[PDB]
Amino acid sequence: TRQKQELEEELALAQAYLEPLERLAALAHGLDKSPFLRVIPFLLTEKELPLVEEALRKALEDRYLLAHEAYAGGVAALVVVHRKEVDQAKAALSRAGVAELRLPGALGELPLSEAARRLKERAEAAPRELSEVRQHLAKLARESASTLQSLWTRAQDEVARLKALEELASGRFGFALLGYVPVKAKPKVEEALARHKESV
Amino acid sequence: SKLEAILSQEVEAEIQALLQEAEAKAEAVKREAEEKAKALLQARERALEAQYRAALRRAESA
Amino acid sequence: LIKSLAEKEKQLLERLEAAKKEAEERVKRAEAEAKALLE
């Protein structure tokens, strides 16, 4: 139940940003970890690219490669200028409305090429993994639910006996109790009373 | 592009500074080696001359 | 996006490698000069 839920959530998070991160890593083929420029990619809305270009012109104009390539459901406006100037430019772009793609797990926590490779591997493996996990869970249910139900019935019986033992009244190494049974059921109750170890 | 170009210009300036520092270190090392060899050769020659003079003095006394 | 950034980073890396090679050559020259002076 942990593994199948984790595989389903991993498939969902991988399919949430599969193609757009691939297009961003395709567009980021010159400065992925180059030591002169950061990479703020924003899978953003429609053509407010001039409003982000206002913040890009607030950054350097002969620098800050900032454009949306493809997969325009979230238009992948990637921006690459500097370290500190790109930090100020990302702050100004978020003031104009922008967000660097900080996903959870490792896809928004690793380098985008390795993140895309791991996300592609997870999206390729998670379907067959979820199917085999569902098959294993169904087989385990069909093979163990009978013993689980028998153990649950025995445990319910033992716990009911334990709860009934609390409601007794002792007599200082003696015990006495009262109850109510039908006079039409007095024959089977008397047969069970004779079936006791003493017929008390 | 402009920021990568400015960083490349700064990298070229740093490479020139590193080459200048290596050249200055080599020059100072050669100067110190020459001074040490000169002092050692002068000390050894003066010690040989002084030992020769003292031995000649003791031999002339004998 | 690709060409200018990758080419500028590769050019700066090649300049740094050439500077390291020149510094190592100057260091080897100074070491050989000190060895010849000592000999």
mmCIF file of all heavy atoms in Angstrom, chain A residues 133-181, unseen atoms left out:
data_model
loop_
_atom_site.group_PDB
_atom_site.id
_atom_site.type_symbol
_atom_site.label_atom_id
_atom_site.label_comp_id
_atom_site.label_asym_id
_atom_site.label_seq_id
_atom_site.Cartn_x
_atom_site.Cartn_y
_atom_site.Cartn_z
ATOM 1 N N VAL A 133 1.625 -4.119 -9.039
ATOM 2 C CA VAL A 133 1.319 -3.918 -7.628
ATOM 3 C C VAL A 133 -0.159 -4.160 -7.363
ATOM 4 O O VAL A 133 -0.528 -4.731 -6.331
ATOM 5 C CB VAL A 133 1.750 -2.508 -7.185
ATOM 6 N N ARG A 134 -1.023 -3.747 -8.294
ATOM 7 C CA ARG A 134 -2.449 -4.030 -8.164
ATOM 8 C C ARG A 134 -2.723 -5.522 -8.274
ATOM 9 O O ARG A 134 -3.556 -6.063 -7.536
ATOM 10 C CB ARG A 134 -3.232 -3.261 -9.227
ATOM 11 N N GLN A 135 -2.004 -6.209 -9.168
ATOM 12 C CA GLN A 135 -2.159 -7.655 -9.300
ATOM 13 C C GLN A 135 -1.668 -8.383 -8.055
ATOM 14 O O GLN A 135 -2.308 -9.335 -7.591
ATOM 15 C CB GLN A 135 -1.408 -8.146 -10.537
ATOM 16 N N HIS A 136 -0.546 -7.931 -7.488
ATOM 17 C CA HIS A 136 -0.018 -8.540 -6.274
ATOM 18 C C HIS A 136 -0.931 -8.280 -5.084
ATOM 19 O O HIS A 136 -1.129 -9.167 -4.248
ATOM 20 C CB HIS A 136 1.388 -8.011 -5.996
ATOM 21 N N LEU A 137 -1.517 -7.082 -5.010
ATOM 22 C CA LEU A 137 -2.452 -6.771 -3.935
ATOM 23 C C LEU A 137 -3.732 -7.584 -4.061
ATOM 24 O O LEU A 137 -4.271 -8.059 -3.054
ATOM 25 C CB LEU A 137 -2.764 -5.275 -3.935
ATOM 26 N N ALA A 138 -4.214 -7.781 -5.292
ATOM 27 C CA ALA A 138 -5.417 -8.578 -5.508
ATOM 28 C C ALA A 138 -5.174 -10.045 -5.179
ATOM 29 O O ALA A 138 -6.020 -10.700 -4.558
ATOM 30 C CB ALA A 138 -5.893 -8.420 -6.951
ATOM 31 N N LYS A 139 -4.011 -10.573 -5.575
ATOM 32 C CA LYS A 139 -3.671 -11.953 -5.250
ATOM 33 C C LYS A 139 -3.458 -12.144 -3.755
ATOM 34 O O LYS A 139 -3.876 -13.168 -3.200
ATOM 35 C CB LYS A 139 -2.424 -12.380 -6.021
ATOM 36 N N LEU A 140 -2.845 -11.163 -3.086
ATOM 37 C CA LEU A 140 -2.646 -11.248 -1.644
ATOM 38 C C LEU A 140 -3.970 -11.174 -0.899
ATOM 39 O O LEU A 140 -4.161 -11.877 0.099
ATOM 40 C CB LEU A 140 -1.706 -10.135 -1.183
ATOM 41 N N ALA A 141 -4.900 -10.343 -1.381
ATOM 42 C CA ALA A 141 -6.236 -10.294 -0.797
ATOM 43 C C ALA A 141 -6.961 -11.619 -0.981
ATOM 44 O O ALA A 141 -7.455 -12.207 -0.011
ATOM 45 C CB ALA A 141 -7.035 -9.149 -1.417
ATOM 46 N N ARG A 142 -6.965 -12.141 -2.213
ATOM 47 C CA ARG A 142 -7.646 -13.395 -2.518
ATOM 48 C C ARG A 142 -6.992 -14.604 -1.862
ATOM 49 O O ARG A 142 -7.632 -15.654 -1.759
ATOM 50 C CB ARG A 142 -7.698 -13.602 -4.032
ATOM 51 N N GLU A 143 -5.743 -14.486 -1.419
ATOM 52 C CA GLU A 143 -5.071 -15.583 -0.748
ATOM 53 C C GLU A 143 -5.012 -15.442 0.767
ATOM 54 O O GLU A 143 -4.736 -16.435 1.450
ATOM 55 C CB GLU A 143 -3.647 -15.740 -1.297
ATOM 56 N N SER A 144 -5.265 -14.255 1.322
ATOM 57 C CA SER A 144 -5.101 -14.053 2.757
ATOM 58 C C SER A 144 -6.332 -13.533 3.482
ATOM 59 O O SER A 144 -6.323 -13.527 4.723
ATOM 60 C CB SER A 144 -3.940 -13.085 3.027
ATOM 61 N N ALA A 145 -7.379 -13.093 2.773
ATOM 62 C CA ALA A 145 -8.535 -12.503 3.434
ATOM 63 C C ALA A 145 -9.324 -13.512 4.255
ATOM 64 O O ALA A 145 -9.928 -13.126 5.256
ATOM 65 C CB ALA A 145 -9.447 -11.845 2.399
ATOM 66 N N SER A 146 -9.296 -14.793 3.880
ATOM 67 C CA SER A 146 -10.016 -15.809 4.643
ATOM 68 C C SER A 146 -9.371 -16.034 6.006
ATOM 69 O O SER A 146 -10.061 -16.065 7.034
ATOM 70 C CB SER A 146 -10.070 -17.115 3.850
ATOM 71 N N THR A 147 -8.045 -16.189 6.030
ATOM 72 C CA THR A 147 -7.333 -16.328 7.294
ATOM 73 C C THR A 147 -7.400 -15.050 8.114
ATOM 74 O O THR A 147 -7.501 -15.115 9.345
ATOM 75 C CB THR A 147 -5.876 -16.714 7.040
ATOM 76 N N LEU A 148 -7.377 -13.890 7.448
ATOM 77 C CA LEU A 148 -7.522 -12.623 8.155
ATOM 78 C C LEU A 148 -8.901 -12.495 8.788
ATOM 79 O O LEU A 148 -9.025 -12.020 9.920
ATOM 80 C CB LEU A 148 -7.262 -11.461 7.197
ATOM 81 N N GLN A 149 -9.943 -12.957 8.094
ATOM 82 C CA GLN A 149 -11.294 -12.861 8.631
ATOM 83 C C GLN A 149 -11.519 -13.867 9.750
ATOM 84 O O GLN A 149 -12.228 -13.572 10.719
ATOM 85 C CB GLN A 149 -12.316 -13.064 7.515
ATOM 86 N N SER A 150 -10.916 -15.055 9.642
ATOM 87 C CA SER A 150 -11.012 -16.032 10.721
ATOM 88 C C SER A 150 -10.278 -15.547 11.965
ATOM 89 O O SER A 150 -10.788 -15.678 13.088
ATOM 90 C CB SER A 150 -10.455 -17.378 10.262
ATOM 91 N N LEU A 151 -9.096 -14.954 11.776
ATOM 92 C CA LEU A 151 -8.362 -14.372 12.891
ATOM 93 C C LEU A 151 -9.103 -13.178 13.478
ATOM 94 O O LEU A 151 -9.089 -12.973 14.694
ATOM 95 C CB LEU A 151 -6.962 -13.965 12.434
ATOM 96 N N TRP A 152 -9.788 -12.403 12.633
ATOM 97 C CA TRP A 152 -10.541 -11.252 13.120
ATOM 98 C C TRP A 152 -11.773 -11.687 13.901
ATOM 99 O O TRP A 152 -12.129 -11.057 14.901
ATOM 100 C CB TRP A 152 -10.938 -10.355 11.950
ATOM 101 N N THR A 153 -12.422 -12.769 13.469
ATOM 102 C CA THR A 153 -13.558 -13.304 14.211
ATOM 103 C C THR A 153 -13.119 -13.876 15.553
ATOM 104 O O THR A 153 -13.780 -13.647 16.576
ATOM 105 C CB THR A 153 -14.269 -14.372 13.383
ATOM 106 N N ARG A 154 -11.993 -14.600 15.571
ATOM 107 C CA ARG A 154 -11.468 -15.126 16.828
ATOM 108 C C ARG A 154 -11.017 -14.007 17.758
ATOM 109 O O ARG A 154 -11.208 -14.089 18.977
ATOM 110 C CB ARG A 154 -10.311 -16.085 16.551
ATOM 111 N N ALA A 155 -10.450 -12.938 17.195
ATOM 112 C CA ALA A 155 -10.015 -11.808 18.004
ATOM 113 C C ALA A 155 -11.202 -11.028 18.543
ATOM 114 O O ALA A 155 -11.161 -10.536 19.675
ATOM 115 C CB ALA A 155 -9.102 -10.899 17.185
ATOM 116 N N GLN A 156 -12.269 -10.909 17.748
ATOM 117 C CA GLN A 156 -13.492 -10.274 18.224
ATOM 118 C C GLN A 156 -14.127 -11.087 19.342
ATOM 119 O O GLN A 156 -14.611 -10.521 20.328
ATOM 120 C CB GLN A 156 -14.470 -10.094 17.064
ATOM 121 N N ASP A 157 -14.090 -12.418 19.223
ATOM 122 C CA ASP A 157 -14.611 -13.284 20.277
ATOM 123 C C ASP A 157 -13.789 -13.163 21.557
ATOM 124 O O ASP A 157 -14.346 -13.053 22.657
ATOM 125 C CB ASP A 157 -14.634 -14.734 19.791
ATOM 126 N N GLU A 158 -12.459 -13.163 21.425
ATOM 127 C CA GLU A 158 -11.593 -13.061 22.595
ATOM 128 C C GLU A 158 -11.693 -11.688 23.248
ATOM 129 O O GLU A 158 -11.680 -11.579 24.479
ATOM 130 C CB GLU A 158 -10.149 -13.364 22.199
ATOM 131 N N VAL A 159 -11.836 -10.632 22.443
ATOM 132 C CA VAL A 159 -11.966 -9.289 22.993
ATOM 133 C C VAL A 159 -13.329 -9.101 23.638
ATOM 134 O O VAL A 159 -13.454 -8.380 24.635
ATOM 135 C CB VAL A 159 -11.714 -8.241 21.895
ATOM 136 N N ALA A 160 -14.365 -9.750 23.101
ATOM 137 C CA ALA A 160 -15.674 -9.712 23.740
ATOM 138 C C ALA A 160 -15.656 -10.455 25.067
ATOM 139 O O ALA A 160 -16.269 -10.005 26.042
ATOM 140 C CB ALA A 160 -16.728 -10.303 22.807
ATOM 141 N N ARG A 161 -14.939 -11.582 25.127
ATOM 142 C CA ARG A 161 -14.780 -12.299 26.389
ATOM 143 C C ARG A 161 -13.986 -11.475 27.394
ATOM 144 O O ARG A 161 -14.289 -11.480 28.594
ATOM 145 C CB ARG A 161 -14.098 -13.644 26.142
ATOM 146 N N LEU A 162 -12.985 -10.737 26.913
ATOM 147 C CA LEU A 162 -12.191 -9.878 27.784
ATOM 148 C C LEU A 162 -13.020 -8.718 28.322
ATOM 149 O O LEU A 162 -12.895 -8.343 29.494
ATOM 150 C CB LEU A 162 -10.971 -9.362 27.024
ATOM 151 N N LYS A 163 -13.867 -8.132 27.473
ATOM 152 C CA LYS A 163 -14.740 -7.053 27.919
ATOM 153 C C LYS A 163 -15.798 -7.568 28.884
ATOM 154 O O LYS A 163 -16.178 -6.871 29.832
ATOM 155 C CB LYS A 163 -15.392 -6.377 26.715
ATOM 156 N N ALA A 164 -16.279 -8.793 28.663
ATOM 157 C CA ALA A 164 -17.254 -9.388 29.565
ATOM 158 C C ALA A 164 -16.643 -9.771 30.903
ATOM 159 O O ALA A 164 -17.351 -9.769 31.915
ATOM 160 C CB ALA A 164 -17.884 -10.618 28.913
ATOM 161 N N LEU A 165 -15.350 -10.100 30.928
ATOM 162 C CA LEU A 165 -14.685 -10.412 32.187
ATOM 163 C C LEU A 165 -14.562 -9.196 33.096
ATOM 164 O O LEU A 165 -14.458 -9.359 34.315
ATOM 165 C CB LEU A 165 -13.301 -10.999 31.915
ATOM 166 N N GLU A 166 -14.576 -7.987 32.532
ATOM 167 C CA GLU A 166 -14.515 -6.783 33.348
ATOM 168 C C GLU A 166 -15.812 -6.522 34.098
ATOM 169 O O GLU A 166 -15.782 -5.899 35.164
ATOM 170 C CB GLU A 166 -14.172 -5.576 32.473
ATOM 171 N N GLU A 167 -16.942 -6.990 33.577
ATOM 172 C CA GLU A 167 -18.248 -6.687 34.145
ATOM 173 C C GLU A 167 -18.688 -7.685 35.208
ATOM 174 O O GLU A 167 -19.876 -7.727 35.544
ATOM 175 C CB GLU A 167 -19.298 -6.624 33.034
ATOM 176 N N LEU A 168 -17.771 -8.483 35.744
ATOM 177 C CA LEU A 168 -18.123 -9.485 36.734
ATOM 178 C C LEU A 168 -18.091 -8.884 38.139
ATOM 179 O O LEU A 168 -17.801 -7.702 38.335
ATOM 180 C CB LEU A 168 -17.187 -10.687 36.627
ATOM 181 N N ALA A 169 -18.394 -9.716 39.134
ATOM 182 C CA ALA A 169 -18.373 -9.309 40.534
ATOM 183 C C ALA A 169 -17.792 -10.447 41.357
ATOM 184 O O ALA A 169 -18.401 -11.515 41.457
ATOM 185 C CB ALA A 169 -19.775 -8.947 41.032
ATOM 186 N N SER A 170 -16.623 -10.224 41.943
ATOM 187 C CA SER A 170 -15.927 -11.296 42.633
ATOM 188 C C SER A 170 -16.434 -11.448 44.059
ATOM 189 O O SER A 170 -17.188 -10.621 44.576
ATOM 190 C CB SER A 170 -14.418 -11.055 42.643
ATOM 191 N N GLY A 171 -16.007 -12.535 44.691
ATOM 192 C CA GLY A 171 -16.383 -12.841 46.054
ATOM 193 C C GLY A 171 -15.199 -13.234 46.911
ATOM 194 O O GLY A 171 -15.339 -14.109 47.774
ATOM 195 N N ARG A 172 -14.039 -12.603 46.665
ATOM 196 C CA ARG A 172 -12.787 -12.833 47.398
ATOM 197 C C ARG A 172 -12.348 -14.297 47.280
ATOM 198 O O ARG A 172 -12.557 -15.112 48.182
ATOM 199 C CB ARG A 172 -12.893 -12.383 48.862
ATOM 200 N N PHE A 173 -11.832 -14.605 46.080
ATOM 201 C CA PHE A 173 -11.537 -15.939 45.555
ATOM 202 C C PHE A 173 -12.846 -16.700 45.447
ATOM 203 O O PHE A 173 -12.963 -17.863 45.848
ATOM 204 C CB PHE A 173 -10.505 -16.701 46.394
ATOM 205 N N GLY A 174 -13.830 -16.013 44.888
ATOM 206 C CA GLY A 174 -15.146 -16.525 44.606
ATOM 207 C C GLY A 174 -15.744 -15.568 43.603
ATOM 208 O O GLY A 174 -15.237 -14.456 43.437
ATOM 209 N N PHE A 175 -16.786 -15.985 42.900
ATOM 210 C CA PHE A 175 -17.383 -15.116 41.902
ATOM 211 C C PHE A 175 -18.869 -15.407 41.806
ATOM 212 O O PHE A 175 -19.291 -16.565 41.879
ATOM 213 C CB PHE A 175 -16.716 -15.289 40.536
ATOM 214 N N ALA A 176 -19.650 -14.343 41.644
ATOM 215 C CA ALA A 176 -21.092 -14.446 41.507
ATOM 216 C C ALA A 176 -21.564 -13.385 40.529
ATOM 217 O O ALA A 176 -20.990 -12.296 40.443
ATOM 218 C CB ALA A 176 -21.801 -14.286 42.856
ATOM 219 N N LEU A 177 -22.621 -13.713 39.796
ATOM 220 C CA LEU A 177 -23.116 -12.821 38.758
ATOM 221 C C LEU A 177 -24.593 -13.088 38.519
ATOM 222 O O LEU A 177 -25.121 -14.149 38.867
ATOM 223 C CB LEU A 177 -22.324 -12.987 37.456
ATOM 224 N N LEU A 178 -25.248 -12.100 37.912
ATOM 225 C CA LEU A 178 -26.660 -12.167 37.580
ATOM 226 C C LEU A 178 -26.849 -11.889 36.095
ATOM 227 O O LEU A 178 -26.047 -11.193 35.467
ATOM 228 C CB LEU A 178 -27.481 -11.168 38.405
ATOM 229 N N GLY A 179 -27.922 -12.445 35.546
ATOM 230 C CA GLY A 179 -28.229 -12.286 34.139
ATOM 231 C C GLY A 179 -29.695 -12.567 33.894
ATOM 232 O O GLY A 179 -30.446 -12.918 34.805
ATOM 233 N N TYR A 180 -30.088 -12.421 32.635
ATOM 234 C CA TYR A 180 -31.476 -12.581 32.223
ATOM 235 C C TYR A 180 -31.539 -13.428 30.963
ATOM 236 O O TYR A 180 -30.946 -13.069 29.942
ATOM 237 C CB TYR A 180 -32.140 -11.223 31.978
ATOM 238 N N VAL A 181 -32.261 -14.543 31.039
ATOM 239 C CA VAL A 181 -32.440 -15.429 29.887
ATOM 240 C C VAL A 181 -33.897 -15.828 29.792
ATOM 241 O O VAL A 181 -34.633 -15.826 30.788
ATOM 242 C CB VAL A 181 -31.566 -16.693 29.992
#
